[PDB]
Design an enzyme around this catalytic site. Structure first.
Site, PDB file in Angstrom:
ATOM      1  CG  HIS A  47       2.988  -8.997  -0.815  1.00  0.00           C
ATOM      2  ND1 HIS A  47       4.242  -7.877  -0.115  1.00  0.00           N
ATOM      3  CD2 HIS A  47       2.659  -8.646  -1.155  1.00  0.00           C
ATOM      4  CE1 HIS A  47       3.385  -6.779  -0.193  1.00  0.00           C
ATOM      5  NE2 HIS A  47       2.379  -6.851  -0.862  1.00  0.00           N
ATOM      6  CG  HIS A  77      -0.081  -7.292  -3.501  1.00  0.00           C
ATOM      7  ND1 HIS A  77      -0.615  -6.910  -2.781  1.00  0.00           N
ATOM      8  CD2 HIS A  77      -0.916  -8.421  -3.908  1.00  0.00           C
ATOM      9  CE1 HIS A  77      -1.966  -7.276  -2.469  1.00  0.00           C
ATOM     10  NE2 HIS A  77      -1.445  -8.278  -3.316  1.00  0.00           N
ATOM     11  CG  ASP A 130       2.975  -2.101  -2.911  1.00  0.00           C
ATOM     12  OD1 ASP A 130       1.756  -3.429  -3.280  1.00  0.00           O
ATOM     13  OD2 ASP A 130       3.458  -2.399  -2.209  1.00  0.00           O
ATOM     14  CG  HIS A 153      -0.502  -6.463   3.420  1.00  0.00           C
ATOM     15  ND1 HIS A 153      -1.275  -6.081   2.908  1.00  0.00           N
ATOM     16  CD2 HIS A 153       0.029  -6.213   2.221  1.00  0.00           C
ATOM     17  CE1 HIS A 153      -1.316  -5.669   1.689  1.00  0.00           C
ATOM     18  NE2 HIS A 153      -0.621  -6.150   1.251  1.00  0.00           N
ATOM     19  CB  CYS A 207       2.251  -4.120   2.709  1.00  0.00           C
ATOM     20  SG  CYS A 207       2.939  -3.200   1.802  1.00  0.00           S
ATOM     21  CE  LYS A 225      -1.803  -1.730   6.912  1.00  0.00           C
ATOM     22  NZ  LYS A 225      -2.020  -0.165   5.831  1.00  0.00           N
ATOM     23  CG  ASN A 276      -4.951  -3.813  -0.997  1.00  0.00           C
ATOM     24  OD1 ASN A 276      -6.180  -4.288  -1.147  1.00  0.00           O
ATOM     25  ND2 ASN A 276      -4.648  -4.781  -1.663  1.00  0.00           N
ATOM     26  CG  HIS A 309       2.720   1.735   1.521  1.00  0.00           C
ATOM     27  ND1 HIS A 309       2.885   2.423  -0.330  1.00  0.00           N
ATOM     28  CD2 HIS A 309       1.656   0.259   1.074  1.00  0.00           C
ATOM     29  CE1 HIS A 309       2.385   1.165  -0.908  1.00  0.00           C
ATOM     30  NE2 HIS A 309       2.358   0.021  -0.218  1.00  0.00           N
TER      31      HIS A 309
HETATM   32  C1  LIG Z   1      -3.677   2.670   4.907  1.00  0.00           C
HETATM   33  O1  LIG Z   1      -1.826   2.739   4.694  1.00  0.00           O
HETATM   34  C2  LIG Z   1      -1.687   3.955   3.236  1.00  0.00           C
HETATM   35  O2  LIG Z   1      -2.410   4.574   3.752  1.00  0.00           O
HETATM   36  C3  LIG Z   1      -3.669   5.203   2.759  1.00  0.00           C
HETATM   37  C4  LIG Z   1      -3.529   6.946   2.697  1.00  0.00           C
HETATM   38  C5  LIG Z   1      -3.448   4.901   1.245  1.00  0.00           C
HETATM   39  C6  LIG Z   1      -3.173   2.937   1.131  1.00  0.00           C
HETATM   40  O3  LIG Z   1      -2.816   2.727  -0.087  1.00  0.00           O
HETATM   41  C7  LIG Z   1      -2.354   1.551  -0.266  1.00  0.00           C
HETATM   42  C8  LIG Z   1      -3.010   0.677  -1.323  1.00  0.00           C
HETATM   43  C9  LIG Z   1      -3.059  -0.575  -1.666  1.00  0.00           C
HETATM   44  O4  LIG Z   1      -1.847  -1.119  -2.941  1.00  0.00           O
HETATM   45  C10 LIG Z   1      -1.699  -1.741  -0.942  1.00  0.00           C
HETATM   46  O5  LIG Z   1      -1.219  -2.426  -1.267  1.00  0.00           O
HETATM   47  C11 LIG Z   1      -2.047  -0.436   0.111  1.00  0.00           C
HETATM   48  C12 LIG Z   1      -1.584  -1.653   1.487  1.00  0.00           C
HETATM   49  O6  LIG Z   1       0.129  -2.175   1.161  1.00  0.00           O
HETATM   50  O7  LIG Z   1      -2.475  -1.873   2.534  1.00  0.00           O
HETATM   51  C13 LIG Z   1      -1.893   0.889   0.267  1.00  0.00           C
HETATM   52  C14 LIG Z   1      -1.410   1.545   2.076  1.00  0.00           C
HETATM   53  O8  LIG Z   1      -0.440   1.156   1.899  1.00  0.00           O
HETATM   54  C15 LIG Z   1      -1.836   2.810   1.993  1.00  0.00           C
HETATM   55 NA    NA Z   2       8.841  -0.389  -3.408  1.00  0.00          NA
HETATM   56 ZN   LIG Z   3       1.919  -2.373  -0.039  1.00  0.00          ZN
HETATM   57 ZN   LIG Z   4       0.811  -5.384  -0.982  1.00  0.00          ZN
END
Ligand SMILES: CO[C@@H]1O[C@@H](C)Cc2oc3cc(O)c(O)c(C(=O)O)c3c(=O)c21
Ligand code: NA
Ligand SMILES: [Zn+2]
Ligand SMILES: [Zn+2]
Length: 227
Positions: free
Chosen positions: A79, A81, A83, A142, A161, A164, A173, A203
């Site tokens: 997407h 963003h 990342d 997401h 994303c 989870k 986020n 992540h």
């Molecule tokens: C809750 O999951 C993860 O753990 C916490 C501690 C920190 C964190 O930071 C993020 C920051 C983002 O820019 C973002 O876009 C996401 C996101 O994809 O929602 C996440 C993400 O995944 C997580």
């Molecule tokens: Na990436």
């Molecule tokens: Zn993400």
């Molecule tokens: Zn994202």
């Protein structure tokens, strides 16, 4: 899970598919690991998601040609963003074919972000010199434009994303999220890929089909803890 740089880690799922973790600082969230995949076939590579910027991307790209001996000719972002397409500018400087959900295209266009060159609206089968790469948009989650990439010959699913990891208790986020549809989208994902060997999230640690159910409840929980 080997290290290839101070901020970049690699893990090998199969002979053709890899997954990488790049560490980066995000204002408001601090040090946060972002995942992406590398797919190889006949010396060519397809990169799913890029690190958040050109430097990490360049490093990652050179490592591929140096350790895997493959040219990065294909890119697909999960997407809009950081990342996902953070280092697409670089890739383009190097003539990389880009494919994305049309909506990702429109979002990057209006926000002055580098833009992918071919959008799809429902599905796209991209051929990495023979080996198929199936991209689908099953609804928002997401993000409104988020897709998933399915590898029919590896039973490996890149969920991005919208999925989870098992050690997550937070919804994360949800600034561009579509919590209204997220839950329906997750159902279509489990329905469509029952036999998924590996399931990689945007992540966190990867796993099996169970990340889908784990994420479904983190969301439902949120819809009601806030309702
Ligand atoms: C809750 O999951 C993860 O753990 C916490 C501690 C920190 C964190 O930071 C993020 C920051 C983002 O820019 C973002 O876009 C996401 C996101 O994809 O929602 C996440 C993400 O995944 C997580
Ligand atoms: Na990436
Ligand atoms: Zn993400
Ligand atoms: Zn994202």
């Amino acid at each position: 899970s080997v290290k290839i740089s101070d901020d970049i880690s690699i893990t090998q799922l199969s002979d053709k598919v890899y997954t990488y973790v790049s560490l980066a600082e995000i204002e408001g969230w601090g040090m946060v690991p972002s995942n992406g995949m590398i797919v190889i076939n006949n010396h060519q590579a397809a990169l799913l998601d890029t690190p958040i910027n050109d430097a990490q991307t360049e490093m990652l790209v050179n490592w591929v040609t140096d350790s895997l001996h493959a040219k990065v000719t294909t890119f697909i972002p999960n997407h809009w963003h950081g990342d996902c397409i953070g280092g697409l500018g670089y890739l383009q400087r190097k003539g990389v074919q880009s494919y994305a959900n049309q909506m990702t295209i429109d979002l990057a266009k209006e926000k002055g972000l580098p833009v992918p060159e071919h959008g799809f609206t429902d599905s796209l089968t991209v051929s990495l010199d023979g080996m198929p790469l199936q991209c689908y948009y099953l609804g928002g989650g997401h993000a409104t434009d988020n897709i998933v990439v399915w590898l029919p010959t590896e039973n490996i699913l890149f969920g991005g994303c919208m999925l989870k990891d098992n050690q997550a208790t937070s919804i994360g986020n949800i600034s561009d999220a579509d919590v209204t549809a997220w839950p329906k989208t997750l159902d279509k994902v489990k329905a469509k890929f029952p036999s998924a060997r590996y399931v990689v999230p945007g992540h966190g640690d990867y796993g099996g089909t169970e990340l889908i159910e784990h994420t479904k409840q983190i969301v439902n929980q949120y819809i009601e803890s806030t309702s």
